[PDB]
Each structure stands twice: as C-alpha cells, then as structure tokens.
C-alpha cells in the first residue's frame, strides 16, 4: 500500500513547478544527487512537465504516475547503478534540453524518447556487468548472450514490461507509426549505453563532429542520440570534485563486490575489479582520459555551449593527480602502529 499512496499524492496534488525544486534546477552546476530520494518521482513529472511532453503527446496523468513509480520500483539497491543514477541521468537530459537548444538538432519524439531512455536504461541492474553474466552462466546471459550487450538488452526488456504492465503504457494512444518509433529509439539509446557499443561508433562520431552537424541527415540524428545518451550517463564527472570522488567510491565498492564473487568462483577478476590491485587515482585517471573526456570533447565540438562540461570533467581528472599521492602513507597510520603489515 506504500506504492499506493505513493501514487495516490502525485495523482492528486498536482506537479510542482520545476523552479521549486531547487532554484538552480535547470543550471550545470546542479547536483541532482542533492535531492532526497522521496521527491524524485515528482522531480521526473517536473521535469516532463516543463519539456511540454505531458501535453505534447497528451499523456494520461494516472498512466504516467503509475510508470514513473514502476520505473523506480524496478532498480534494485547496489552501491552505483541504482535509482539515483537513474534519476540523475534523466535530470542531465533535462539540462542539455535547457541549455543546449536540442530543438535545433533533434525531433520532438527523439527527445521524449531520450528522456524515457535516461530514466530506464540501466533498469534491474545487479552490481555486475557483461562478462560477469557470462562467467557466472546467468539467466540473462542465456537470453542474450549470442546478441552481446547482455545487460542493456535486458534493460530494455524491462522497460517494455513496464510498458506492458496494465495501467502503464505511456505509449498506447500513440499511432502504431509513431509507437513503433518511439520503442526503436528506446531500444537504439538504451543500447548506446553498453561501452563496447560506444568504442565501435567513436570514430564515426568523429568524423560527424568534424563534418558538421547535419540535421538533416538521419544517421547524424542516431549519432547524436548515442553521443548524448553516453554523456547523460557519466554526467557526475561534470560536476564538483566532491561528486566526482562520491561517485568514485560507489563505482568501486560496487566492482569490489563483483570481485570478490569472482574470487570466490575461482576466476581472476579484472584488475579495476580487485580490491587487492586496483590503484583507484591510476584508474580513475585512465577512465577520464580514454572515456569520459573524449565524449565531453565531442559534445564540445558539436555543441559550443557544452564548453564549461569538458572543461569541469579535465578539472575533475587533475584534481585525481593532485590528490593521488595522499593514496601513500607516510609516517605511521594514525593508530601509530604497523600492525596491518
Ligand atoms: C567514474 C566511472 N569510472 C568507471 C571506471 C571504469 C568503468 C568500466 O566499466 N571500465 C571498463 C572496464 C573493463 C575494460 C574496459 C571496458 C569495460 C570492461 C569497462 C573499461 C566504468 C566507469 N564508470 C561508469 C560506467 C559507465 C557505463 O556505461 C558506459 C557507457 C554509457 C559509455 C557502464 C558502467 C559504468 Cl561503471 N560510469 N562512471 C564511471
Ligand atoms: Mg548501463
Ligand atoms: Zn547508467
């Protein structure tokens, strides 16, 4: 009945204004993390609102009150991919359709449907990635291990049972045309979020940066969703160093978690994955200077206004640099002893 009443308020008491959330919501500098987890499903119905998709495609309010909490219901509590990465995620789309004029690149419907994607593309997630589930023979890795990107397939498998749970089709007064689409989107922007997907498109999305952005070339639009959807989903390096080094410590208990699994199957974990190798401020660096800040560079190129992004997400990266060195102790342990030898 918790869910119930739940949905009972954001039915009935109406969508607060964006503003009132916090009064630089819609700004870069914003840490959607800042938001207690108990106001983020009517903080997503906000942000819906004041994109004008709630009256563009005339969702049924009930319909998207009981998706928005489905949706929520369907993360489960590991350390980092859990619902307020999700939400946070979808709070970065709603800050590059504020701040970066989409409207000029993108169609409506691909918007929507970047937004819907942000909000489920990582949804069930357990704690591990692909090559876990072929390890370990899961029950995803079954389904989808001959297809590759056994996680995202299952995500958005999850999100099209959301849809197809009575009394939460977003979609279904939509145009078996414009339906159709919007599922194809879901399914092409969920996919983008698997890294192997991303190192095979990157030089593509190179050559589209340097070209120049045409709008109305169609492999430019599904370029561009792809870019923007990697860049939504690692959008905590674009903020302070405090959530860069929070965020850190999520990612890292959680692969520690995967692990010790690993171990414990008798397999050698990935190096980034064992608590007893792994050197964090290398790794991090690495991570920020092969992956997060090429993408934040392309956004750059397409995008002049994404400037103050990368130049935050180069910050973040020297500032791993500046502190590594603290990750040696000298003198003695603060208890004076060597016990831990
Ligand atoms: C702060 C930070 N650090 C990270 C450090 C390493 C890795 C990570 O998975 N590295 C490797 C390890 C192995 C060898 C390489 C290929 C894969 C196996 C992944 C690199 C990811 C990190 N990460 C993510 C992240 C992003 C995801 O989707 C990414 C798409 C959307 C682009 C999926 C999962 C995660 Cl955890 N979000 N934030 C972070
Ligand atoms: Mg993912
Ligand atoms: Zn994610």
Not at 25 to 30: G, L, P, R
Not at 295 to 311: G, V
């Amino acid at each position: 009945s918790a869910m119930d009443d739940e949905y009972t308020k954001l039915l009935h008491d109406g969508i607060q204004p964006v503003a009132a959330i916090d009064s630089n919501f819609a700004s870069f500098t914003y840490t959607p993390r800042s938001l207690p987890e108990d106001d983020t499903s009517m903080a997503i119905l906000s942000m819906l609102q004041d994109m004008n998709f709630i009256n563009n495609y005339k969702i049924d309010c009930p319909t998207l009150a009981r998706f928005c909490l489905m949706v929520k219901k369907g993360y489960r509590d590991p350390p980092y991919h859990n619902w307020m990465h999700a939400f946070s995620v979808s709070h970065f789309c709603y800050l590059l359709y504020k701040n970066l004029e989409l409207t000029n690149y993108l169609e409506d419907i691909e918007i929507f449907a970047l937004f819907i994607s942000c909000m489920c593309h990582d949804l069930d997630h357990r704690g591990t990635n692909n090559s876990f589930q072929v390890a370990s023979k899961s029950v995803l890795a079954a389904l989808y291990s001959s297809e590759g990107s056994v996680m995202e397939r299952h995500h958005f498998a999850q999100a099209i049972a959301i849809l197809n749970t009575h009394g939460c089709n977003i979609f279904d007064h939509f145009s078996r045309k414009d339906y159709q689409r919007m599922l194809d989107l879901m399914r092409d922007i969920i996919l983008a979020t698997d890294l192997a997907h991303h190192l095979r498109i990157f030089k593509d999305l190179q050559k589209m940066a340097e070209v120049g952005y045409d709008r109305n070339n169609k492999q430019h639009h599904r370029l561009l969703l792809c870019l923007l959807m990697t860049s939504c989903d690692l959008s905590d390096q674009t903020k302070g160093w405090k959530t860069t080094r929070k965020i850190a410590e999520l990612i890292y208990k959680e692969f520690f978690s995967q692990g010790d699994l690993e171990k414990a199957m008798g397999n050698r974990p990935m190096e980034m994955m064992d608590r007893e190798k792994a050197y964090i401020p290398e790794l991090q660096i690495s991570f920020m200077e092969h992956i997060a800040m090429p993408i934040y560079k392309l956004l750059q190129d397409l995008f002049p206004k994404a400037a103050e992004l990368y130049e935050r997400v180069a910050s973040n990266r020297e500032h791993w640099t500046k502190v590594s060195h603290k990750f040696t102790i000298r003198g003695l342990p603060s208890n004076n002893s060597l016990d831990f030898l």
